[PDB]
Symmetry: D4
């Protein structure tokens, strides 16, 4: 079970918040010299800790006013879970999809311009999928918090 | 005014947040200087809100991922107080007020059930604004990206 | 109370579909001369059988792309229902409100431009009303049928 | 499309509540001369903003004392949704039907003389529809508000 | 114990009376192959034992214009003497024929009769929901009666 | 057509189906013969449909009262077949097709959970027309009368 | 039939199942021979069905305790096939057919959510007789004993 | 902590099923001499691995023919949880009580002679507890499986 030191956590905490920092900029943030700082970054990156760097966008800025959480009930037939998994990976409007432990078989998170766009997706793609028994959706009224930064204080 | 090129820039940067302008301009078929102008404007307008290192939960021993459905107390200030506190809980990555029976959906990460339990009993349910909560946990990730769809703009 | 016959039913059927027929046009299709037709229609109005003539609009034509069914739970406090009723009647986005027999205390039918408008209303107006314990909402994916015409065949 | 101003909105606000006003009456209320007023209404009709004029009746006055909200669960089979939609459009007791985003696949609003008539409809027509999986209903205890007027001032 | 107390002919008497509560002793005795005197003694024991708790005329609801039969699910408020106060009021409401505290999510299940939905609505809005003990109620209505008897099964006593 | 006196007759007999005409006459404030004649009209109008002895469940070792919520199979004749079977199960006193989520509500009596369990598992759930069933049991009987309200008729 | 002393023996042994007969008899105020006779009769009668060492779940790295609500498919032998399988799943300690909307409630133990996920996805949901399952997890154990109440017998 | 080898596991597997085996019998089972076996068991006890030895009884043999699973809703005040836990620990008919992650706050497992006894407990002890908001229950129709033995193969 992974264990990091005080400054390696600091590095990871800076990178999560600012994925596009030069080494000097990171060095300054974590209180190291660029050489030791770069050396630390290597090993973290080489450990698989960092899986991707991403630009995160404002959904409103690209006319995606509608954010849906869709609860999908899967058909109880063979390959339905697999087939559905495969299709969801090819739907760009669905950002995330998890098999969950409760009543909802799959929770999907998806973005749309408006309800008309959402309606076309649900009726013409989602519910028509041979592996999908049913779906029900709720929508975002307000984003309270949304970060991609994982908690790391358990590592110290 | 986002055209085919602005969209491509956005699509490339969502997948590869750490691309050099050299590689960016190449992938979006622009000379370096026009490309750097476009990106900067996209950044200044707030279309690009942040660049982020995305870590692997497993790699950092966060094996338990929770979706917590929170029922808020029906009292003045509860919603604000709760929102204010959730912003200070680093195990909670996102919190959305929703349109259905669930008032707030939280997505959070923990090492194991023990850590989750300490959070729920001693922090979440003990918050004066929280009436109740129930949770589900991830059995399997089928998909997870931070990339928004952009095709509707085209 | 009026006694409605074949001809009165025909009048109501004709006007439910075509509310703006002139008396001459109405009289032409119902088997009453224009004078008795005029008189009978005023009787139907005066009896409260015809409660209103309305122009019906297309929601999409006036940028109302979001139609919501809002299930509201009322607080068990004195005046909650009465204060809620009074408020609902002054909320223009809300077209219909019915106290119902099942688990939902009140069902509201409302129109909005988009989810953002819906959110402002739910958060700033509905959920902040002192009589309102909670709300949950569903939205129209597709209109299969929508008429204002009541069935009248049982009267024949 | 058309560009709507205060006067156009007023024309629409007035006709939504007073569907049967003569052109002269309408022109007096909206502060337009009869000729321009006539032209303008034709344009609003032609644009599809005004889709119908209807006499609205009192359900009680025509012995339709039971108003049902029916939540219908559709069978997951090919053509079930379309066969159901086709049939619903031929059932005069059902005034509206909407496919919704939540747990209910379709919400129906229907009027009946009484529970007897409801029960005949449900047992002999609705639940026996090959496309219908199940139905459950709620009935109106009290009407708090019921209008057909859409809110328009967002256009100003 | 009833198994000890009641024999095959005492069962027969209870079955007969459950279906035909207005039989004289001579009639009852004739259907149970008993003489009036013993038959009357046996019935007396059954009434004194509390086995037969009541005789009643059962009416057709439709014949008295009671077209609406409701099953009402009531949630009690968690307060001192909410349950007691509610039971007291429900015992006074003639439209409610039966009320049970149940083991599941529904706190109380009520069975009630009304002429139509308007009368149901007046009861619910003005009487039931206004009651300080009542947190909430939700109701279903009979589409069709498949079976309705008051006769208890007695074969286990044999 | 029913007047105040007809209402009194039905009210009285609902509570005591064994009352002699003499006693009934007194309670409804009629002479014996006009009272006997009114009651025959009511019996012949269908208004009185039955006279019944009502027994104590506890007295006959039926200490378990169940309300069973049955989901019917969505098939031709599953309803008709379930209905025909229910009519032949003496432990089931009442069965109604309802308007809500519960397709059929059955009211039934058993000695104990043991006998209930045998009924549920070997008779109810094994029926071809039964999709599922779930049950609640009586904790306390607050009220139980067979008497209909009649005040609406006056 | 169980007298006051038999009850005492059962009370003591439910809490201390490995006591010597000498120790046992000292705690019930009996000589060893009578105490030994009594215990043997209780064992022969089937009253004491087993002696068991009880373990700390956390001590053996079983930090996740699950309650699994399983819906059985409506098909011939599904229930029986599901029962037989459950009996061969060591992670499942108990399984009850219940009266409410949950057909079967299982109590099971796992090291963590990863192990739980494997069991649910690869074993449970893949069983032909399982239509659906949903689970909850222990946040805190408030009380857990194996001792049956015996005061009703006194 | 105490690190378990295969022979410690075998001791636990054997004693979980037969908690009353003598040291001679236990050591024979697990392929040890009596003395080492005695020491190993003591250490497993001292480490808290074996927390208790128990005589397990047949519920039916002692007239406990009703087994209930009680889903309790706790009153949402700071005192309710601790007061309920304290009271539950003193109710012998409740064998186990767990706070769960789902909608049910606490799940109780409890035994009674019959529905009379259960009802008395629920109405007069449980529902009347100041910390209990509500409770709902299910009952065992059939025990498919019931053991106290934990699985231990993950340790091998
Ligand atoms: Ca599911
Ligand atoms: Ca809510
Ligand atoms: Ca409600
Ligand atoms: Ca659905
Ligand atoms: Ca309840
Ligand atoms: Ca149903
Ligand atoms: Ca079930
Ligand atoms: Ca809860
Ligand atoms: Cl999966
Ligand atoms: Cl929208
Ligand atoms: Cl909020
Ligand atoms: Cl559709
Ligand atoms: Cl009605
Ligand atoms: Cl019982
Ligand atoms: Cl011991
Ligand atoms: Cl043993
Ligand atoms: Cl875990
Ligand atoms: Cl043993």
């Amino acid at each position: 079970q992974l264990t990091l030191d005080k400054t390696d956590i600091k590095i990871l905490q800076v990178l999560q918040e600012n994925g596009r920092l030069t080494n000097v900029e990171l060095s300054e943030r974590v209180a190291l010299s660029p050489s030791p700082c770069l050396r630390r970054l290597k090993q973290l990156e080489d450990a698989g800790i960092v899986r991707q760097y991403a630009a995160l966008l404002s959904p409103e800025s690209v006319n995606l006013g509608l954010q849906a959480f869709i609860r999908v009930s899967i058909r109880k037939a063979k390959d339905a879970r697999e087939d559905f998994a495969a299709s969801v990976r090819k739907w760009p409007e669905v950002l995330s999809c998890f098999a969950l432990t409760g009543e909802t078989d799959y929770l999907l998170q998806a973005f749309f311009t408006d309800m008309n766009a959402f309606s076309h997706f649900v009726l013409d793609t989602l519910l028509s999928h041979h592996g999908v028994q049913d779906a029900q959706s709720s929508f975002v009224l307000k984003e309270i918090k949304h970060t991609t930064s994982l908690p790391l204080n358990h590592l110290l």
